[PDB]
Amino acid sequence: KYDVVIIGSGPAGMTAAMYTARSEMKTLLLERGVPGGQMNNTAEIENYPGYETIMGPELSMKMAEPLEGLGVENAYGFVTGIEDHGDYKKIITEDDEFITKSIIIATGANHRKLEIPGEEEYGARGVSYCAVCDGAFFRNQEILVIGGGDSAVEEALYLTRFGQSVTIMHRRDKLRAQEIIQQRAFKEEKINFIWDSVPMEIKGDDKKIQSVVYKNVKTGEVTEKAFGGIFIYVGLDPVAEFVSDLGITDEAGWIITDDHMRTNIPGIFAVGDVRQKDFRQITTAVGDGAQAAQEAYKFVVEL
Amino acid sequence: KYDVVIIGSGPAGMTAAMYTARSEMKTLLLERGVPGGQMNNTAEIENYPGYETIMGPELSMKMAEPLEGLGVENAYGFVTGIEDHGDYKKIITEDDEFITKSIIIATGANHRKLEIPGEEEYGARGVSYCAVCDGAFFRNQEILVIGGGDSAVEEALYLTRFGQSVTIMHRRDKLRAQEIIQQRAFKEEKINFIWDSVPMEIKGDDKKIQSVVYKNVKTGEVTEKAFGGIFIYVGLDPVAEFVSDLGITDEAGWIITDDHMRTNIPGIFAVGDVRQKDFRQITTAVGDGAQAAQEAYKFVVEL
Ligand SMILES: Cc1cc2nc3c(=O)[nH]c(=O)nc-3n(C[C@H](O)[C@H](O)[C@H](O)COP(=O)(O)OP(=O)(O)OC[C@H]3O[C@@H](n4cnc5c(N)ncnc54)[C@H](O)[C@@H]3O)c2cc1C
Ligand SMILES: Cc1cc2nc3c(=O)[nH]c(=O)nc-3n(C[C@H](O)[C@H](O)[C@H](O)COP(=O)(O)OP(=O)(O)OC[C@H]3O[C@@H](n4cnc5c(N)ncnc54)[C@H](O)[C@@H]3O)c2cc1C
Ligand SMILES: NC(=O)c1ccc[n+]([C@@H]2O[C@H](COP(=O)([O-])OP(=O)(O)OC[C@H]3O[C@@H](n4cnc5c(N)ncnc54)[C@H](OP(=O)(O)O)[C@@H]3O)[C@@H](O)[C@H]2O)c1
Ligand SMILES: NC(=O)c1ccc[n+]([C@@H]2O[C@H](COP(=O)([O-])OP(=O)(O)OC[C@H]3O[C@@H](n4cnc5c(N)ncnc54)[C@H](OP(=O)(O)O)[C@@H]3O)[C@@H](O)[C@H]2O)c1
């Protein structure tokens, strides 16, 4: 009944859907939340070719805008599973079932947790995984950011609009982030560093975070310091629960594809951050997306 | 002396250069003409995520704009060869030589010729490979477009702004172009079709094209019809002469890479239309580009 169903309307899925529709495939794009995925949790995007800078949510809007006019069927759905029935597949949401000849999985990735005490307890209360969502709640605080990669360092620079200071805690003596972002963090006066450290505990009164305990990973020295907010940016986990049974994920849960975005399962493709890969960006999400769209077109042509 | 040299400033090369520079690689971007590559020969771009529609040359400008500010070294150069010297490489232009630790080849593809009589003769004179360049020269003419793929059909729709009529000649009974583009050509009143045919000869007086002779590929019937212009869009050839000796091309001249954009030759990567692949688009040029940039960064880190 559908030629293609695409799960997830971040930039990879939205690009796929734009292509399947231009190919006049009967196209359903399922999204559990707001179109844009992670781009909506991004303050400022500087490295998407075509725009010198653009707010995450504006880029999200621009990419979603033409889909309806192309005849993409945009629907709300949280997908809970996928059943393969050889010459077709069933996708199960909370309420519905959807029959399709092919699937492009574009469900991305989610924040990795610290799994330390106080992290859950203070979830609503000074612990955040999204600077653009929560930063203004921490005006004039001492903010802590945990992590050393592009999200930690970039989101720390953003958080300097709000905090008295922002401190980046990284578990080595060298950041992983892009040099230009590093260099911008080195130079920014409101950014402090706690190198070679990991957090051990988040502590607070009954209402909110007050301090963090942390350990130096070369000496074992333990320190506790006061902070009003903690943003955690220590990497990503796949968002692929609905396919765990299917034999298409690696040991860590990422979807395995070949270079044409194909899983084991004919007619089931995956794109973007959810795939097992190293280089997660909007550019590679968009490319993966277009590639999947084309492979699905071909797959459906042969069916 | 360079960490990376990128040859070609179309969207693939310009994306690569934006990434190498953000990685603070000492970056040279060589281009023989105007930044934008094929996008400059494109009238209207509708399928680049982020823009609902945008003129080829405007998208070119936007992608070129931030490169200087990132510290990309933008230079004029036509590259004639590349010499590998193990731990470095030499790139030869017409006038200069450039030493670099890595190369990202992003030189794209060029129009395939018909190789029929009158095609060279009337080159300046009613034969064109670029509708956006020459279309207005053919106001009120009967225009012919040869080809059945996305460029023929899309450039024919554009040419309808200028011609009395535009006729698409395709060598089968089914277009290769995207269905949406087909459907738009079917519906457009100024677009005629000559199906199942190939052109045999382009004829003219001393000053210009007047007619085309063509053959039906199922019956052998030969017909000659009057036209004032002919646009030829019958596919692409690689632009990779400077590496022919190097053992990195297939029998047709396309550069062979793996999925991380690597050739045989360590430190020599290729991206975009110049690679051996099937799916040539701005989205996949941009993705390939970002991927190469990252692989080059890593390659140079290990050197
Ligand atoms: C703070 C931050 C800043 C970033 N900045 C940049 C940047 O500047 N440049 C850059 O190139 N990259 C950036 N990235 C990375 C980039 O945003 C991602 O690589 C990209 O968004 C991946 O797109 P995707 O479509 O694969 O996944 P996502 O954007 O993660 O989209 C996945 C979508 O699937 C939906 N979903 C998940 N599960 C289900 C389900 N079961 N059913 C229905 N829907 C589901 C989600 O709601 C989501 O909308 C940044 C990331 C972060 C966190
Ligand atoms: C008419 C037309 C319309 C199109 N429309 C679309 C569209 O709507 N959407 C879409 O996604 N795709 C479209 N495409 C395809 C798209 O433009 C290409 O896939 C894309 O431009 C490839 O980019 P690239 O950087 O790999 O190569 P190119 O854009 O071809 O750039 C290669 C660059 O290398 C330079 N160069 C070549 N040799 C040398 C040398 N020896 N030394 C120095 N410089 C050199 C050239 O000057 C050129 O600037 C279209 C193509 C055409 C012809
Ligand atoms: N502008 C952009 O292009 C942009 C922006 C944001 C994200 N992204 C991309 O998105 C993907 C994910 O980015 P990310 O930064 O969220 O994740 P990431 O690249 O996995 O980096 C997470 C960082 O946190 C560190 N870390 C892990 N556990 C830690 C702990 N317990 N304490 C302190 N530090 C810890 C890691 O250490 P190690 O480094 O030692 O492993 C790493 O530096 C990447 O591919 C990234 O490039 C891109
Ligand atoms: N909007 C876009 O996304 C866009 C726009 C333009 C180009 N592109 C991409 O650019 C790449 C190249 O596009 P293209 O259209 O230039 O080339 P193409 O896809 O190779 O198509 C060339 C077309 O011309 C036909 N042909 C070849 N020789 C012929 C002859 N002698 N007489 C009549 N017809 C002949 C081919 O026939 P067969 O079909 O029988 O082989 C084919 O249909 C493609 O990957 C394309 O998708 C994309």
Residue numbers in the entry:
A (entry chain A), B (entry chain A): 5 to 307
Extract from the study:
The recycling of Trx is catalysed by the homodimeric flavoprotein thioredoxin reductase (TrxR) that utilizes electrons from NADPH which are shuttled through a tightly bound FAD co-enzyme and a redox active dithiol motif. Lactococcus lactis, an industrially important LAB model bacterium, contains a TrxR that recycles two Trx (TrxA and TrxD) as well as NrdH, a glutaredoxin-like protein providing electrons to ribonucleotide reductase class Ib13. The overall structure of LlTrxR is similar to other low molecular weight (LMW) TrxRs317 with a dimeric organization in which each monomer is composed of NADPH and FAD binding domains. While investigating the biochemical properties of L. lactis TrxR (LlTrxR) we discovered that the enzyme is susceptible to photo-inactivation by visible light in an oxygen-dependent manner.
The LlTrxR structures were obtained mainly in the FR conformation, which was unexpected since all available structures of LMW TrxR from other organisms are in the FO conformation, except for the engineered complex between EcTrxR and EcTrx6. The propensity of LlTrxR to crystallize in the FR conformation may indicate that the enzyme is stabilized in this conformation. Superposition of LlTrxR Cα-atoms with the structure of EcTrxR36, gives RMSD of 0.426 Å and 1.137 Å for the enzymes in FR and FO conformation, respectively. The relative orientation of the structures thus matches perfectly with the E. coli enzyme and consolidates the catalytic model proposed by Waksman et al. (1994) where the NADPH domain rotates 66° relative to the FAD domain in order to switch between the FO and FR conformations in the catalytic cycle. Tyr237 is only close to the isoalloxazine ring when LlTrxR is in the FR conformation, suggesting that photo-oxidation reactions are primarily taking place while the enzyme is in this conformation. The re-face of the isoalloxazine ring in the FO conformation is occupied by the Cys134-Cys137 disulfide while in the FR conformation it is surrounded by hydrophilic residues (Asp154, Glu158, Ser155 and Gln285). Met43 positioned on the si-face bends away from the isoalloxazine towards Pro15 and the sidechains of Met18 and Met67 and as a consequence a pocket on the si-face is formed. In the space between the β-carbon of Met43 and the isoalloxazine ring (7.2–7.4 Å distance to N10 and N5) a well-defined electron density appears, assigned to a water molecule perfectly centered above the central ring of the isoalloxazine. This water molecule is present in all structures listed in Table 1. The water is in hydrogen bond distance from the 2′-ribityl hydroxyl group (2.8 Å) and the alcohol group of Thr46 (2.8 Å), and the distance from the water to the N5 and N10 atom of the isoalloxazine is 3.5–3.6 Å.
